[PDB]
Design a protein around this nucleic acid. Structure first.
Ligand SMILES: [Mg+2]
Ligand SMILES: [Mg+2]
Ligand SMILES: [Mg+2]
Ligand SMILES: [Mg+2]
Ligand SMILES: [Mg+2]
Ligand SMILES: [Mg+2]
Ligand SMILES: [Mg+2]
Ligand SMILES: [Mg+2]
Ligand SMILES: [Mg+2]
Ligand SMILES: [Mg+2]
Ligand SMILES: [Mg+2]
Ligand SMILES: [Mg+2]
Ligand SMILES: [Mg+2]
Ligand SMILES: [Mg+2]
Ligand SMILES: [Mg+2]
Ligand SMILES: [Mg+2]
Ligand SMILES: [Mg+2]
Ligand SMILES: [Mg+2]
Ligand SMILES: [Mg+2]
Ligand SMILES: [Mg+2]
Ligand SMILES: [Mg+2]
Lengths: 100, 51, 205, 68
RNA sequence: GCGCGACCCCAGGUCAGGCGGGACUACCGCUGAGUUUAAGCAUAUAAAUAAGCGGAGGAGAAGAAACUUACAAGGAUUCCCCUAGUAACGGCGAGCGAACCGGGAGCAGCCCAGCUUGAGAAUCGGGCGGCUGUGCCGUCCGAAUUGUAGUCUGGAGAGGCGUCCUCAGCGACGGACCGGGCCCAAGUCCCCUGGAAAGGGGCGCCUGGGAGGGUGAGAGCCCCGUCCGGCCCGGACCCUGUCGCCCCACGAGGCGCCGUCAACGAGUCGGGUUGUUUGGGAAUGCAGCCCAAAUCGGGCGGUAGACUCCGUCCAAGGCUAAA
RNA sequence: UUGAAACACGGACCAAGGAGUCUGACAUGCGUGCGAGUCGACGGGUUCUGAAACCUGGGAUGCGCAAGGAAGCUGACGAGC
């Protein structure tokens, strides 16, 4: 961000000094999905299949019940952050199949 | 039997004196070394010393 | 309990007499550390006895950010800007810290100058007798070399006190220092309500 | 750790030293590092290092210095 | 009427090996009270203590951030001071009670798994033989492709290019530290008392030695010792100090650019609930059971919750001195 | 103990031992030193009978120098009888 305002109070309080930009670090790609790993993980999905709750979630996403798709996912996975993401993931799988 | 109030090693063996009070006392001691009557009275045979 | 005294609160209800730590070995601790330092000095001679070079850092936490002290080690950028390779620095007496960051330019500049200042007064013996490879030194240099002791690069904790004299100008006398503080505090606490009234503007208006 | 194919592997020689006898009975394997609270570092784990009992002893000590 | 090959199991007084028990100061793991205090007593406290069951070393444990902070931010672990009898916790009672910052002691960082030998398992054990012998060499069996070696570990890295810049060992003598044996100043001069002179008086001497002890009573000089050091013998050493010969590379590393790649630990994390523990308070750690992940993803920012932004770090494998 | 010579208890005698201490927190008083300061108490340096003594740091460590508020916060404009 822009450096502080030079004043001890208020927005952007603090001591002015030339702010600077930090080069990307390894682990600034941390979590970035990659080709071969995704290739392996997709392939296992057809071989392995779907968990029973993952099957249940899509069914309600197939009816159109977005809320319950999230609400079932949450009681299973535990948190809204993971439940929100898994619903989106099931919705994605649903749109790569029911497209045809 | 055991003694009343057995002595322990966490008695206060060492006592602290202010850095400045130590220096003041050294100054007083040095001055008294320059007084013949006090060097005599403390027991030193100083009777053929020149000065 | 009785007369107007302070409320007693001594924590002596456990078996505290089994964990009494006395300090009768304090003078012996000083001697063992002195012998340890002295023995270490010989086994590292001629390398300096203070250790590797430490960079300037500002302390954390409001109470101390105005004071400079020694940090763990130089960042990778400080090392690379001064042109000291990453894996050579600990071998020539310069500590490294792969974790520290450079958010403000002045700090980075200050620690770069230390590395050149250190490099200027650094001398390196050859790895063998007569071969002189890169980074080595002249025989004259290697005879003038002694074991420097103490703090060969001191760190000034903070800004020296200076009370200059200037002329008090009309703008200076008009400026409201207290008025500035109260209006700037005001803006901080209205930040949400102002942004909300703004935010709802584009939602409705 | 008596097998010569182990004693000549630099990556596993450490397990032959006497300081590693019965690592599991002293809580020093991965599972041991787990139930000892050592998976984590900051506050929320500071009492577990060096050990919970070593931390307790240190906090129990009455330090009566010579000049006090 | 077979003989196969592998898989999983046998039994061997088979070849060669490693295990158990002992000691308690300090260290690591488990289990676990009550007396007592609260002027009664049950949560609490005593105490995450005593007892009980085990496991180590010369130290042990911890250790290289899924850390703190909110700052101009800092930067592994441990210990001391301070923080601080503080924030907090508590029949908010009796009581209990840390951490960050800061200042010191000491400082050091490493290595794996995974896509990446395929013209080629380049790796490793054992028998036997030889030699320079804590190892190296030859050969024959075997382990291992359900994966040994090499690369690589996020700070990166694989590639590509490039003036460049960097790399091999053994002698010889030592210095230090370690143990041991020996050698080393000067009155026992004269008188008195006394069983005994080491006491008194006289006259002398040593002292870088008047620490201590013995010897028939307060002995520097009688003896052993003490000071200053001298000598001779034996070690461990893997630390560095110089002379000698050998000369490091087309392999790897550094550094300059590139942007194409860029792999990173799963009944684990995480959530619920139960019990314990904590100063940790809508839950500090730990453990049972249930549910059970992700890869523009994950863990945190000390009040539970949804969204936008911001700071921060990268768990689920391992080693690591010093204080 | 209100009251003991007591029909209250303890004491046959003698020798030796035998009970308000040490530590931590606080308070008042007194002594010493310095004084808007004051502490060198964890360390470092130096020290040849001394585990002593002596030097050093502190530009902010503790206490004091400013208080009222639960907090966000604000913070003594100069005394007369
Ligand atoms: Mg328990
Ligand atoms: Mg008790
Ligand atoms: Mg009671
Ligand atoms: Mg009672
Ligand atoms: Mg009772
Ligand atoms: Mg016990
Ligand atoms: Mg260890
Ligand atoms: Mg205080
Ligand atoms: Mg407790
Ligand atoms: Mg003699
Ligand atoms: Mg005589
Ligand atoms: Mg004698
Ligand atoms: Mg002699
Ligand atoms: Mg709990
Ligand atoms: Mg370890
Ligand atoms: Mg009566
Ligand atoms: Mg009567
Ligand atoms: Mg009676
Ligand atoms: Mg009687
Ligand atoms: Mg008596
Ligand atoms: Mg002060």
């Amino acid at each position: 961000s822009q450096p502080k305002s030079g004043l001890f109070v208020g927005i952007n309080k603090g001591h002015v000094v030339t702010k600077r930009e930090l080069p990307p670090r390894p682990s600034d790609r941390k979590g970035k999905g990659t080709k071969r790993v995704h290739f392996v993980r997709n392939l296992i999905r057809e071989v392995a299949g779907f968990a029973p709750y993952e099957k249940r979630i899509t069914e309600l996403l197939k009816v159109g019940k977005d809320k319950r798709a999230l609400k079932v996912a949450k009681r299973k996975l535990g948190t809204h952050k993971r439940a929100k993401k898994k619903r989106e993931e099931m919705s994605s799988v649903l749109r790569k199949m029911r497209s045809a | 039997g055991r003694m009343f109030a057995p002595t322990r090693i966490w008695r206060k063996w060492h006592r602290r004196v202010n850095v400045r009070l130590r220096r003041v006392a050294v100054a007083s001691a040095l001055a008294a070394t320059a007084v013949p009557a006090i060097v005599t009275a403390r027991g030193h045979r100083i009777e053929s010393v020149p000065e | 309990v009785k007369h107007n005294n302070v409320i007693p609160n001594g924590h002596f209800k456990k078996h505290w007499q089994n964990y009494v730590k006395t300090w009768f070995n304090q003078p012996a601790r000083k001697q063992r550390r002195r012998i340890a330092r002295q023995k270490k000095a010989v086994k590292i001679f001629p390398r300096p006895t203070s250790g590797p070079l430490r960079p300037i850092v500002q302390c954390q936490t409001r109470k101390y950010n105005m004071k400079a002290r020694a940090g763990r080690g130089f960042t990778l950028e400080e090392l690379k800007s001064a042109g000291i390779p990453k894996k050579l620095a600990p071998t020539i007496g310069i500590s490294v810290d792969h974790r520290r960051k450079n958010r403000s330019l002045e700090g980075m500049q200050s620690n770069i100058q230390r590395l050149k200042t250190y490099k200027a007064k650094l001398v390196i013996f050859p790895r063998r007798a007569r071969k002189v490879k890169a980074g080595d030194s002249t025989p004259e240099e290697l005879a003038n070399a002694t074991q420097v002791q103490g703090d060969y690069m001191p760190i000034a904790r903070g800004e020296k006190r200076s009370v200059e004299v200037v002329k008090v100008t009309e703008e200076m006398k008009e400026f409201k220092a207290y008025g500035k503080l109260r209006v700037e505090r005001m803006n901080q606490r209205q930040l949400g309500a102002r942004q909300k009234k703004a935010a709802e503007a584009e939602k409705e208006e | 750790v008596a097998h010569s194919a182990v004693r000549n592997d630099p990556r596993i020689n450490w397990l032959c030293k006497p300081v590693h006898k019965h690592r599991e009975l002293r809580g020093l394997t991965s599972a041991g590092k787990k139930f000892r609270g050592l998976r984590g570092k900051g506050h929320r784990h500071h009492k577990n290092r060096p050990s919970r009992r070593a931390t307790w002893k240190r906090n129990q000590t009455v330090s009566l210095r010579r000049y006090r």
